[PDB]
């Protein structure tokens, strides 16, 4: 049975814990990969965690200088939900230093980019059989979401970036069926910057919130349908979402608000409910520490700084990182709506602490319409390890 279309996002009042890895706490004595950018994707029968490995084990001699991302040794693998990414639990998926993957009900589609900096190549597989390839069109680092793609009515949709990291770039939407590309569209967004988009299905369209690394401290959004016609804009609230960011103030949803801290950013997410918005953001204005979920009842049509409730995930004394959004659909649960969920990455090592490596673990939450609570679920490892001395 294939994931159909037309069902709206479910009504929600809070977020309930779903999973925790405890990966770096176990990698102190066990065999655990050195991973980063872990995302979660669900299909008709199970939910899995995909991650990008550096090709080395934690607490080893080969984990030296693993702060660098592009190398011929990274691979994309996956394991069941809530289980430590061990060599004995993980299933090989693809060869890549940038990747994404979703499901269309029965099977798995994966996209993985590898190659030199100037002529990188993306390989598209469906159930382990290579079905397509795409090549860079601007001669600069070509990269993708690092979170799940959206697959509805047998068609899967992704967005791909190419070009400079501090100027105008160039963007494509890809529409894929059963593993091979059937269409693509060039997004004309003069004055924008889309990177690392998080996408979810709403109504009969796809809704994505992206990252700006050139001159924005709020987040840009794109919306498109199955004919690849797009609307673009910025989140219109005055409660900014990117890190680094300025103090809360006047927002704008026709263009970026710089205020001195636009350059740089982190992967993030927001969920739209009519006129309101749920914004996921870190607690510190300069570093990646803490995490909270803010509910703004006018966040999509008004530029004020006032809100209506805050629930906290990680306190201000602990490290966070990337965050992303996924969905659990009515073919699994059995309802008439899609349950929204999110995940958070937690980074340990360089550049902020005194080690030779860098790794990350994850936690995952799902939205519910009932009583919930706010607490702190940090990483909890005691660094440095044995190899660092």
């Amino acid at each position, epitope marked *: 049975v294939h994931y159909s279309s037309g069902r709206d996002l479910c009504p929600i009042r809070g977020w309930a814990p779903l999973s925790k890895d405890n990966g770096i706490r176990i990698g102190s004595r066990g065999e655990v990969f050195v991973i980063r950018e872990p995302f979660i994707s669900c299909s008709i029968s199970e939910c899995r965690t995909f991650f990008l490995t550096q090709g080395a084990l934690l607490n080893d001699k080969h984990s030296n200088g693993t*702060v*660098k*991302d*592009r*190398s011929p040794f990274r691979t994309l693998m996956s394991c069941p939900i809530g289980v430590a990414p061990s060599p004995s639990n993980s299933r090989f998926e693809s060869v890549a230093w940038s990747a994404t993957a979703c499901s269309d009900g029965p099977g798995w589609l994966t996209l993985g980019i590898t190659g*030199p*900096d*100037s002529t990188a190549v993306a390989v598209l597989k469906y159930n382990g059989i290579i079905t397509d390839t795409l090549k860079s069109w601007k*001669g*600069n*680092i070509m*990269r993708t979401q690092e979170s799940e793609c959206v697959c509805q009515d047998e068609f899967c949709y992704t967005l791909v970036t190419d070009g400079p*990291s501090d100027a105008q770039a160039f963007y494509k939407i890809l529409k894929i069926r059963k593993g091979k590309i059937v269409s693509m569209k060039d997004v004309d967004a003069t004055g924008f910057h889309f990177e690392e988009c998080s996408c979810y299905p709403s109504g009969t369209e796809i809704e994505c919130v992206c990252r700006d690394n050139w001159r924005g401290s709020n987040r840009p959004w794109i919306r498109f349908n199955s004919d690849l016609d797009y609307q673009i804009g910025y989140v219109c609230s005055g409660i900014f979402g990117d890190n680094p960011r300025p103090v809360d103030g006047t927002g704008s949803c026709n263009g970026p608000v710089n205020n001195g801290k636009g350059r*740089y950013g982190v992967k993030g997410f927001s969920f739209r409910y009519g006129d309101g918005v749920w914004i996921g953001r870190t607690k510190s204005l300069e570093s990646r520490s803490g995490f909270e979920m803010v509910w703004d009842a006018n966040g999509w049509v008004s530029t004020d700084k006032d809100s209506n409730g805050v629930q906290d995930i990680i306190d201000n004394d602990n490290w966070s990182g990337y965050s992303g959004s996924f969905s659990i659909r009515g073919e699994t649960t059995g309802k008439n709506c899609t349950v929204p969920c999110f995940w958070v990455e937690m980074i340990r090592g360089q*550049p902020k602490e005194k080690t030779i490596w860098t790794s990350g673990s994850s936690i995952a939450f799902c939205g519910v319409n009932s009583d919930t609570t706010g607490w702190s679920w940090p990483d909890g490892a005691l660094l440095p390890f044995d190899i660092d001395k």
Partner: nanobody
Amino acid sequence: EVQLVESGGGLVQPGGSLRLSCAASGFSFTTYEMNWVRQAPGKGLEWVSHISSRGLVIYYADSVKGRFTMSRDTAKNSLYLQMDSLTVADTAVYYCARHYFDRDWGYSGMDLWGQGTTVTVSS
């Protein structure tokens, strides 16, 4: 065993030309960014030139523009700096240095240097 080795230094009468080479081992030029730096006689360091992993010559120092051409070759992992119209103000020691560009943090810093080669210009 990551390392760099320079070659091509020597003595040149003013107005001449030279061609310096830097040979690398242990890594690839398809992922890293390269630099030519120099130290004059009794003076501090000066940044001369910078090339990018995608092959584009991002920067040339003002004092040495129109006379210097930085280039590379990835099939042999070699870096070249042809220089023309030398002046007595170019006697120096030259190093090739390496650094990186990350797409999440960005531009770490020069952590690998070659042993350097010497060039003199006089009569």
